[PDB]
PDB file of N, CA, C and O in Angstrom:
ATOM      1  N   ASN A   1      11.552 -31.439  20.150  1.00 30.53           N
ATOM      2  CA  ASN A   1      10.641 -30.368  19.660  1.00 30.53           C
ATOM      3  C   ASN A   1      10.251 -29.390  20.778  1.00 30.53           C
ATOM      4  O   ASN A   1      10.585 -28.211  20.676  1.00 30.53           O
ATOM      5  N   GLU A   2       9.588 -29.832  21.855  1.00 30.39           N
ATOM      6  CA  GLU A   2       9.145 -28.994  22.985  1.00 30.39           C
ATOM      7  C   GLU A   2       9.648 -29.545  24.331  1.00 30.39           C
ATOM      8  O   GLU A   2       9.327 -30.675  24.714  1.00 30.39           O
ATOM      9  N   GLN A   3      10.440 -28.749  25.057  1.00 31.75           N
ATOM     10  CA  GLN A   3      10.968 -29.099  26.381  1.00 31.75           C
ATOM     11  C   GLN A   3       9.857 -29.336  27.426  1.00 31.75           C
ATOM     12  O   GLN A   3      10.034 -30.150  28.334  1.00 31.75           O
ATOM     13  N   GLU A   4       8.696 -28.683  27.278  1.00 33.37           N
ATOM     14  CA  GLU A   4       7.516 -28.892  28.134  1.00 33.37           C
ATOM     15  C   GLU A   4       7.006 -30.340  28.075  1.00 33.37           C
ATOM     16  O   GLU A   4       6.703 -30.937  29.112  1.00 33.37           O
ATOM     17  N   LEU A   5       6.923 -30.925  26.872  1.00 32.22           N
ATOM     18  CA  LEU A   5       6.555 -32.330  26.683  1.00 32.22           C
ATOM     19  C   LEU A   5       7.710 -33.267  27.064  1.00 32.22           C
ATOM     20  O   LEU A   5       7.465 -34.306  27.675  1.00 32.22           O
ATOM     21  N   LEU A   6       8.960 -32.904  26.745  1.00 30.16           N
ATOM     22  CA  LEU A   6      10.162 -33.699  27.038  1.00 30.16           C
ATOM     23  C   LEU A   6      10.294 -34.038  28.537  1.00 30.16           C
ATOM     24  O   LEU A   6      10.648 -35.167  28.883  1.00 30.16           O
ATOM     25  N   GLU A   7       9.949 -33.103  29.433  1.00 28.46           N
ATOM     26  CA  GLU A   7       9.926 -33.332  30.888  1.00 28.46           C
ATOM     27  C   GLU A   7       9.068 -34.551  31.286  1.00 28.46           C
ATOM     28  O   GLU A   7       9.487 -35.357  32.121  1.00 28.46           O
ATOM     29  N   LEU A   8       7.883 -34.708  30.682  1.00 29.16           N
ATOM     30  CA  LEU A   8       7.005 -35.868  30.875  1.00 29.16           C
ATOM     31  C   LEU A   8       7.451 -37.084  30.041  1.00 29.16           C
ATOM     32  O   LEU A   8       7.346 -38.219  30.508  1.00 29.16           O
ATOM     33  N   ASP A   9       7.993 -36.869  28.838  1.00 29.26           N
ATOM     34  CA  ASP A   9       8.488 -37.918  27.932  1.00 29.26           C
ATOM     35  C   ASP A   9       9.553 -38.821  28.586  1.00 29.26           C
ATOM     36  O   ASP A   9       9.631 -40.014  28.284  1.00 29.26           O
ATOM     37  N   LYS A  10      10.344 -38.273  29.521  1.00 30.01           N
ATOM     38  CA  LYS A  10      11.336 -39.016  30.316  1.00 30.01           C
ATOM     39  C   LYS A  10      10.666 -40.138  31.124  1.00 30.01           C
ATOM     40  O   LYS A  10      11.086 -41.294  31.055  1.00 30.01           O
ATOM     41  N   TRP A  11       9.602 -39.805  31.859  1.00 29.56           N
ATOM     42  CA  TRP A  11       8.782 -40.755  32.623  1.00 29.56           C
ATOM     43  C   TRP A  11       7.871 -41.628  31.745  1.00 29.56           C
ATOM     44  O   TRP A  11       7.557 -42.755  32.132  1.00 29.56           O
ATOM     45  N   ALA A  12       7.497 -41.175  30.542  1.00 30.80           N
ATOM     46  CA  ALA A  12       6.718 -41.966  29.580  1.00 30.80           C
ATOM     47  C   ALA A  12       7.407 -43.292  29.175  1.00 30.80           C
ATOM     48  O   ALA A  12       6.730 -44.244  28.780  1.00 30.80           O
ATOM     49  N   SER A  13       8.737 -43.393  29.318  1.00 28.85           N
ATOM     50  CA  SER A  13       9.487 -44.635  29.069  1.00 28.85           C
ATOM     51  C   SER A  13       9.069 -45.762  30.028  1.00 28.85           C
ATOM     52  O   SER A  13       8.994 -46.914  29.600  1.00 28.85           O
ATOM     53  N   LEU A  14       8.735 -45.457  31.294  1.00 30.66           N
ATOM     54  CA  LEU A  14       8.221 -46.458  32.246  1.00 30.66           C
ATOM     55  C   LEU A  14       6.871 -47.026  31.781  1.00 30.66           C
ATOM     56  O   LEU A  14       6.608 -48.214  31.967  1.00 30.66           O
ATOM     57  N   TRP A  15       6.029 -46.197  31.157  1.00 27.20           N
ATOM     58  CA  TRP A  15       4.715 -46.585  30.630  1.00 27.20           C
ATOM     59  C   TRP A  15       4.833 -47.684  29.561  1.00 27.20           C
ATOM     60  O   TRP A  15       4.121 -48.690  29.609  1.00 27.20           O
ATOM     61  N   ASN A  16       5.765 -47.516  28.614  1.00 27.67           N
ATOM     62  CA  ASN A  16       6.076 -48.518  27.587  1.00 27.67           C
ATOM     63  C   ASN A  16       6.806 -49.741  28.177  1.00 27.67           C
ATOM     64  O   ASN A  16       6.478 -50.875  27.825  1.00 27.67           O
ATOM     65  N   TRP A  17       7.760 -49.537  29.092  1.00 25.16           N
ATOM     66  CA  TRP A  17       8.480 -50.620  29.775  1.00 25.16           C
ATOM     67  C   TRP A  17       7.537 -51.571  30.525  1.00 25.16           C
ATOM     68  O   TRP A  17       7.629 -52.784  30.344  1.00 25.16           O
ATOM     69  N   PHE A  18       6.587 -51.032  31.301  1.00 22.77           N
ATOM     70  CA  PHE A  18       5.586 -51.805  32.048  1.00 22.77           C
ATOM     71  C   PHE A  18       4.797 -52.785  31.162  1.00 22.77           C
ATOM     72  O   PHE A  18       4.497 -53.903  31.582  1.00 22.77           O
ATOM     73  N   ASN A  19       4.499 -52.390  29.917  1.00 24.73           N
ATOM     74  CA  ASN A  19       3.843 -53.232  28.917  1.00 24.73           C
ATOM     75  C   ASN A  19       4.660 -54.510  28.629  1.00 24.73           C
ATOM     76  O   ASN A  19       4.119 -55.615  28.677  1.00 24.73           O
ATOM     77  N   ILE A  20       5.975 -54.373  28.403  1.00 27.37           N
ATOM     78  CA  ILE A  20       6.915 -55.490  28.209  1.00 27.37           C
ATOM     79  C   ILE A  20       6.959 -56.418  29.434  1.00 27.37           C
ATOM     80  O   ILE A  20       6.866 -57.636  29.274  1.00 27.37           O
ATOM     81  N   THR A  21       7.054 -55.875  30.654  1.00 27.69           N
ATOM     82  CA  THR A  21       7.050 -56.667  31.900  1.00 27.69           C
ATOM     83  C   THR A  21       5.764 -57.487  32.058  1.00 27.69           C
ATOM     84  O   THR A  21       5.825 -58.684  32.348  1.00 27.69           O
ATOM     85  N   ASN A  22       4.595 -56.873  31.834  1.00 27.75           N
ATOM     86  CA  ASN A  22       3.296 -57.553  31.892  1.00 27.75           C
ATOM     87  C   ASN A  22       3.126 -58.612  30.780  1.00 27.75           C
ATOM     88  O   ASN A  22       2.592 -59.693  31.033  1.00 27.75           O
ATOM     89  N   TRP A  23       3.610 -58.331  29.566  1.00 29.57           N
ATOM     90  CA  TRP A  23       3.622 -59.269  28.437  1.00 29.57           C
ATOM     91  C   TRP A  23       4.468 -60.515  28.730  1.00 29.57           C
ATOM     92  O   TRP A  23       3.980 -61.633  28.580  1.00 29.57           O
ATOM     93  N   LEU A  24       5.706 -60.352  29.212  1.00 30.31           N
ATOM     94  CA  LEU A  24       6.573 -61.465  29.632  1.00 30.31           C
ATOM     95  C   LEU A  24       5.896 -62.371  30.677  1.00 30.31           C
ATOM     96  O   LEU A  24       6.037 -63.595  30.613  1.00 30.31           O
ATOM     97  N   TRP A  25       5.113 -61.787  31.591  1.00 29.49           N
ATOM     98  CA  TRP A  25       4.313 -62.506  32.589  1.00 29.49           C
ATOM     99  C   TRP A  25       3.258 -63.447  31.974  1.00 29.49           C
ATOM    100  O   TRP A  25       2.974 -64.497  32.546  1.00 29.49           O
ATOM    101  N   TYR A  26       2.679 -63.111  30.812  1.00 28.26           N
ATOM    102  CA  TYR A  26       1.746 -63.984  30.092  1.00 28.26           C
ATOM    103  C   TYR A  26       2.466 -65.191  29.452  1.00 28.26           C
ATOM    104  O   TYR A  26       1.923 -66.301  29.445  1.00 28.26           O
ATOM    105  N   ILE A  27       3.682 -64.993  28.922  1.00 27.50           N
ATOM    106  CA  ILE A  27       4.471 -66.043  28.251  1.00 27.50           C
ATOM    107  C   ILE A  27       5.014 -67.068  29.264  1.00 27.50           C
ATOM    108  O   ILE A  27       4.855 -68.277  29.073  1.00 27.50           O
ATOM    109  N   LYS A  28       5.675 -66.579  30.324  1.00 25.15           N
ATOM    110  CA  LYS A  28       6.300 -67.387  31.392  1.00 25.15           C
ATOM    111  C   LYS A  28       5.312 -67.918  32.451  1.00 25.15           C
ATOM    112  O   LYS A  28       5.758 -68.679  33.343  1.00 25.15           O
TER     113      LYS A  28
END
């Protein structure tokens, strides 16, 4: 939709990924 948001949306994937890494730490 907007290239201005897309520039930040690329790095926003690390924000969601970090949640999975921290969650796995609670299980293991």
